């Protein structure tokens, strides 16, 4: 599960940049 | 969810934008 | 403001680690 | 906001947890 | 350069794309 | 304070994401 | 799994650290 | 907060510089 | 191994967050 | 040690705290 | 290039410096 | 310590190497 844990860290940084003032919702759930 | 979509294969900026508020 | 932009990047990383499977909303505005 | 709370002084892990789902 | 342009006021995605190859 | 260095670190990450396969150029000048 | 993309993100961080005033290009390929 | 943000980047830099050797991070003055 | 290299980068970020004022040794071969 | 423990399974922040000084 | 050289075996900061301007 | 030494002005790689085990 570590691969997904590491990927998720980069995903949240990417969402932070892309979403700007809107923010985002991060769920890992399927 | 985003982990299934975007950790299996690379999401574009546009695809990532789907998960914004 | 770039200073807040940089801080927020670190905030999101910290939320990612703290919140675990819960995930989180990041909503600047407040 | 989280920004006003946690970018002006350091938030503890417990304070951060308030912003979890 | 990017540092002058983007280290005081936030650069958008479009602005950042100026520094792609 | 090392603020320009810190800013640049975040800029490179952003360029990496935005530019994709093209890649990017970074100069601190 | 997006391992090559994740590797590149860390590569650019490393280049940022080691490289000097003339900066760098990142051109994966 | 500035020192907190800086420290995050410092540990990342130490990680790369030191490699297998590892490192000691303390904020102790 | 690069996978372990990337994991460790994230480990030390997480240790930085968790350990706070205590700091930490990072000893990957232990 | 930490690599054997935490690069093959996800360590929580409590498990990571075990490695602090 | 750098991805082929450095994404399975760890590149030193010396090997990496070769990619600098 | 390192915060005093390396957060006011940038530390070189040699200076950072001081903190390696
Ligand atoms: Cl920062
Ligand atoms: Cl990674
Ligand atoms: Zn930062
Ligand atoms: Zn990573």
UniProtKB/Swiss-Prot annotation, chains A, C, I:
- Source organism, top-level taxon: Eukaryota
Which species expresses this protein natively? Homo sapiens
| Name by which UniProt lists this protein | Insulin B chain
Name the reported effect of residue 22 to Q. Answer: In MODY10; reduces binding affinity to INSR; reduces biological activity; reduces folding properties
What lineage does the source organism belong to?
A: Eukaryota, Metazoa, Chordata, Craniata, Vertebrata
Per the record, the gene is: INS
Curated annotation (Swiss-Prot), chains B, D, E, J, K, L:
- The superkingdom listed in its UniProt entry is Eukaryota
| Disulfide bond positions | 6-11
The name this protein goes by in its record: Insulin A chain
Q: Which residues of the full protein are shown?
A: 90 to 110 of 110
């Amino acid at each position: 599960f570590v691969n997904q844990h590491l990927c998720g860290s980069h995903l949240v940084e990417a969402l932070y940049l892309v979403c700007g003032e809107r923010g985002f919702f991060y769920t890992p759930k399927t | 969810g985003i982990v299934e979509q975007c950790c299996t294969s690379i999401c574009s900026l546009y695809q990532l934008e789907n998960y914004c508020n």
